[PDB]
Amino acid sequence: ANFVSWKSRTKYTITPVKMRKSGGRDHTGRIRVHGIGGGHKQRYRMIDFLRFRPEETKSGPFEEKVIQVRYDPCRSADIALVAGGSRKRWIIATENMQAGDTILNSNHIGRMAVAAREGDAHPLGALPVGTLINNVESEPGRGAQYIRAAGTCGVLLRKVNGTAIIQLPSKRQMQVLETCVATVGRVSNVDHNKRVIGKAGRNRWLGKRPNSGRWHRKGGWAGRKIRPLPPMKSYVKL
Amino acid sequence: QDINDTVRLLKEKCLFTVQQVTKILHSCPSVLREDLGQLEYKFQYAYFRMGIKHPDIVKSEYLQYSLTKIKQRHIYLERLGRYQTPDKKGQTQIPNPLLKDILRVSEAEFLARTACTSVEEFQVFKKLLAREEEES
Amino acid sequence: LTYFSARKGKRKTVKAVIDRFLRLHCGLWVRRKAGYKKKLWKKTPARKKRLREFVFCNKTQSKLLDKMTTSFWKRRNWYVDDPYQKYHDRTNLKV
Amino acid sequence: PKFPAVRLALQNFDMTYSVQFGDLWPSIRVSLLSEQKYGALVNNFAAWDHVSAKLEQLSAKDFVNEAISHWELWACSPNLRCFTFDRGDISRFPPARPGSLGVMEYYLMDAASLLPVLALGLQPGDIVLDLCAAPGGKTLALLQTGCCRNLAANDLSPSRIARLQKILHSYVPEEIRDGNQVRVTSWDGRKWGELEGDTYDRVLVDVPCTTDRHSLHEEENNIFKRSRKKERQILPVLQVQLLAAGLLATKPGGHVVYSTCSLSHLQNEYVVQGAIELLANQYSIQVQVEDLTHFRRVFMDTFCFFSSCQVGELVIPNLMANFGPMYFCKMRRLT
RNA sequence: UUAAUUUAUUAAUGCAAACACCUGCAUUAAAAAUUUCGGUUGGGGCGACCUCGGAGCAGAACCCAACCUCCGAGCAGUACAUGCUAAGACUUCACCAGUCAAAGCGAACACUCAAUUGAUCCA
RNA sequence: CCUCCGCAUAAGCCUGCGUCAGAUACACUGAACUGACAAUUAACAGCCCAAUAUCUACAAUCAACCAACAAGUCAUUAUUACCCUCACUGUCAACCCAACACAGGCAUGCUCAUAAGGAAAGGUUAAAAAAAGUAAAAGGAACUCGGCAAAUCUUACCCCGCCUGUUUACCAAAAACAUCACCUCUAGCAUCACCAGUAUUAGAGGCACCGCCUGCCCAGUGAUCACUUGUUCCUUAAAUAGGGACCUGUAUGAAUGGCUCCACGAGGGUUCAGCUG
RNA sequence: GCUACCUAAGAACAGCUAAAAGAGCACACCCGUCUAUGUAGCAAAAUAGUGGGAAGAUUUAUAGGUAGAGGCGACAAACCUA
RNA sequence: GCUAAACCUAGCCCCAAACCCACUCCACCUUACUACCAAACCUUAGCCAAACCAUUUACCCAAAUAAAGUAUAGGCGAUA
Ligand SMILES: C[S@@+](CC[C@H](N)C(=O)[O-])C[C@H]1O[C@@H](n2cnc3c(N)ncnc32)[C@H](O)[C@@H]1O
Ligand SMILES: [Mg+2]
Ligand SMILES: [Mg+2]
Ligand SMILES: [Mg+2]
Ligand SMILES: [Mg+2]
Ligand SMILES: [Mg+2]
Ligand SMILES: [Mg+2]
Ligand SMILES: [Mg+2]
Ligand SMILES: [Mg+2]
Ligand SMILES: [Mg+2]
Ligand SMILES: [Mg+2]
Ligand SMILES: [Mg+2]
Ligand SMILES: [Mg+2]
Ligand SMILES: [Mg+2]
Ligand SMILES: [Mg+2]
Ligand SMILES: [Mg+2]
Ligand SMILES: [Mg+2]
Ligand SMILES: [Mg+2]
Ligand SMILES: [Mg+2]
Ligand SMILES: [Mg+2]
Ligand SMILES: [Mg+2]
């Protein structure tokens, strides 16, 4: 239809961007997803999920200073504004990240496993086995996709030959190249799950529309009856 | 395909959950080499005729045992009147013996405790049951 | 039946009648007995003979069959070796 | 069917037979639902010697021959031969064929069904009655003895008596089935007393029963059908009438056998007790029940018996020897 | 929906083609689609019944007692000319079906039974 | 005497009670009817903008304390380019959507009772029945399906549903739906939904706050460990019954049921006291 | 252009009590519990009284979207121009 | 004697023949009738008939007639 996505920005900025609500509709205009509509207006803060992004005409490990740690409407986790050189960007804040903290981003894989400080982002090869990690990439230089919800931590289980097994928070193992970068520690806003919505009105503010009033028989189907077995059903007590 | 077909049958046809499927694979690896038709039939047998819910099948390691053995034990008990299939409501007049004391136990132990019959009676019953399945 | 065709605007023959009946030119219709091929093992020789017969139809039946066939089927035919040739004309019939 | 008739039989039997038999009921229950063991009764009019040899090749043994040997450690009906397999053998006899003479070699029937016939101590030149002959089996065995001067076959249903004619024709020659030699009737058995009294040396009475074996398996024309529920209720009454009717027809000093296919003591013991009581009051005729302890003892090898019956003998099915239930009570008319 | 007929659609699988996708074929599921829901029995549940033969039952040619009350039948046995043909007739109130039969040819010296049964198409 | 209306803007309509002259759903020979003539004048409002890069973390609430959560309504710079001006359009009315000059529907500002806007009675009489009010001796629910209506303004409960909320526009507002919380199932992932999200997430569902009880088909005895048993192979014609391996990196079970309870309800029932035609 | 839901950018909410709220009383505003009137009516659903809510899962103006084998739905088989 | 009644001709119908239309100026795809700026091709289905319905059930295609409702087709039914 006349739907145009709000996601038009081509240049990264730290300025909050005006975003348009979907209502769970498509470009076509029909609903694809139910229970979405009309919360508090929100502004999008663009997040650089690529922690190892060296500045223009710069290369190698770089350090950044945390300017502030801030609430974000668009995600469960808190975000941090971080400054390095002449660049400011938004990143996902860790559990223990404060203003004034200094964080390092390196692409250096160490022969001897480097000490893993909470704020820093390192390749999985550099990181010791058993370290709590977050903001992992499936492919080298792809960007963080995997552990970015509030209070979520992955575990680097083992490191074989240029490969690393990590445990996603759903207790599912994933194969990742050692060259891929992850952020150490747990994500901010622990005990987010412990929050109490309290009233129906709060979910409406969060933009969640109420569930359908229609009664469904069962979420799962009934087991299909095989050819000889039917007499064994619908036994009546007397 | 062989592995994929097995897990599909359990998830879709047998309506086992992902967690339950994994446990079945962990505990009964013999299901994979087993024919799909036979595996489906075995599940159908426990679910309807024996009136066993999904969690119990997985826990009691039912799919481990051979289909032949299941028939001999259950039909004997059912015909003895000791085992009664659950109704539509699911309630039974006399509680059914547990699969622990049916399949897990030996032939001798089953007859002594559950079946409450001599061995010679059960031996001749095997032959009759074996014949019945031949005509099908 | 089709009294008037969409293509030609003509009366149509019912082809069922042609498959089952013979018209003699004199106006009689000939038919086989029903069930003459059926279950002969359980039937008496007398009954079997009765079944293996070519029998004429009622006036009412003849009138029905006439209406269900066009004039073509009612024409005089001079077939080269016709087994029913002699039966086409009536002899010594009074009213 | 919305609700199977065979299910009603299971429900009915479970509530009554469990209390009747106790721990024995499970054993009986499994046997009833399992496949029936069959005995081959050799046709005497056929080549008895050749068939006996043939069946012996199949490792079948004539139990009645063995029974006669151990009888003398009255006498049973002679000229009866029934081959059955050993205990714990599930072997089936091959289907019977016509013989050289044109009569079938053997008849496949329940071995327990012969016991009422054997209980009746048939003697040559005896006038014998069978009130409920159809479809056959028992009445065929009567003819096999060859001790029947005059045999009367009766059954209420002409449908079932037609089946008997087919059995009689196939097994018994026309010579044996002469005029008044074998009489076949389709009349009511209850009114037999007034028809003819003090006629028969021996009467076999096989009343309609719940047909425990048959009711569990065969759905068609099941007695446990809700349409036939009224028949079941009046069945104990009807059974007494028939047994009484048989007693009237019997000459004083004569013997009758009451055979029932059911486990129920209602249709077994109370019917016998009731018939004696009815006859003693209404007609002032005394009946003495003949003990069959010796008879049960002889046939322990082939058949297991339920040793708790006040009157008569009940054969219970066992999974070892799956012979259909048979309650036979032999009694003599004193007056 | 556990009614019948489908899988055109979607998804997966296998086999071809092609050197993963696409195409053709087949199989399995989901999702639907088209169509129907005979008759008697207060009405409803549990039942019964629908065709053929017999009796109450037309007192005496034929026919005729709905509904009801009862019974039965859905075979079987003996031949193996239970071959062929053909006057005249009967007929379940129509038709379709069904029934009897002289003479003749050929043989020999058109069976018993109350019903014991099924058109057309099609194979 | 009324004013619960008015004045203006927006939206809608489009000359639809101005002048003159005529014929003629109460009527004025006058009408809003017919014909002719006239009129709404921009400052208000509409109608905007050279290009390419680049900039834009810090709400609003008297914005100061204080306190947050649902996280928010308004910012540029550098270089190039640039010199002509007040054009065009709305401006009326007693007005729109409801077939009508319809007790209806209709956004905003100001006036919160008017400085603005209107008239319930065509004339008479004072019957019945009908409608709306006012007053009523003594009694105070005796009425009735029911304290419906009115008067009076009230207690203590029971059932149901936690609650605020939603629903059959036009016969059902509820005990139905939703709902916090809890539980089940499904999913390891980018450039058009979910989502510029990522398992403390998202979707599909169940139940309905909280609070208190309700939880094993994990192999049995005996003294972590031996041993038949369970599962798989082979020998055995093949079996019976013998030879070998494993069950020791972990398991929890209920979209289960009951139980009171605070608050609340135009819910259904009972009740105290008063009160009233 | 009604209505169900959504999107964009807007607007409205007096006074009184309250440690301060999907709080209470209560205007405007939204709705429609109960009764009476009306039943070719003022009205193809209205009027008067009495009621429920009235800072919010609130009410409402403007423009846009979803279309019938469909949409939309806090499921009433609701609403999608009487 | 009121209301009324009465009328004949605008035009139309079927054929035949013949192959029709198309700028005063100005305006008109944006909110049409507003002078003036950075992408089309794609099996019709169904009612209906078959006394239900499920395969099936005439519908122009190159000019009369006749072959002929014939050969054929078809729950070999209806019908084509
Ligand atoms: C259980 S069967 C007899 C079994 C048979 N003798 C056999 O061994 O195969 C009883 C028979 O008696 C018949 N019957 C029932 N009532 C009867 C009566 N009043 N008079 C005569 N026969 C009767 C039944 O129709 C049935 O055929
Ligand atoms: Mg969000
Ligand atoms: Mg629900
Ligand atoms: Mg006739
Ligand atoms: Mg008649
Ligand atoms: Mg002759
Ligand atoms: Mg004018
Ligand atoms: Mg201006
Ligand atoms: Mg004024
Ligand atoms: Mg007035
Ligand atoms: Mg007046
Ligand atoms: Mg009055
Ligand atoms: Mg008063
Ligand atoms: Mg009262
Ligand atoms: Mg009171
Ligand atoms: Mg009263
Ligand atoms: Mg009131
Ligand atoms: Mg008053
Ligand atoms: Mg509520
Ligand atoms: Mg509220
Ligand atoms: Mg409420």
Ligand SMILES: [Mg+2]
């Ligand atoms: Mg509403």
Ligand SMILES: [Mg+2]
């Ligand atoms: Mg309503």
Ligand SMILES: [Mg+2]
């Ligand atoms: Mg209402």
Ligand SMILES: [Mg+2]
């Ligand atoms: Mg509810």
Ligand SMILES: [Mg+2]
């Ligand atoms: Mg309420």
Ligand SMILES: [Mg+2]
């Ligand atoms: Mg919005």
Ligand SMILES: [Mg+2]
């Ligand atoms: Mg206020």
Ligand SMILES: [Mg+2]
């Ligand atoms: Mg409030």
Ligand SMILES: [Mg+2]
């Ligand atoms: Mg309030």
Ligand SMILES: [Mg+2]
């Ligand atoms: Mg709604």
Ligand SMILES: [Mg+2]
């Ligand atoms: Mg409902």
Ligand SMILES: [Mg+2]
């Ligand atoms: Mg409904």
Ligand SMILES: [Mg+2]
């Ligand atoms: Mg409409």
Ligand SMILES: [Mg+2]
């Ligand atoms: Mg039709």
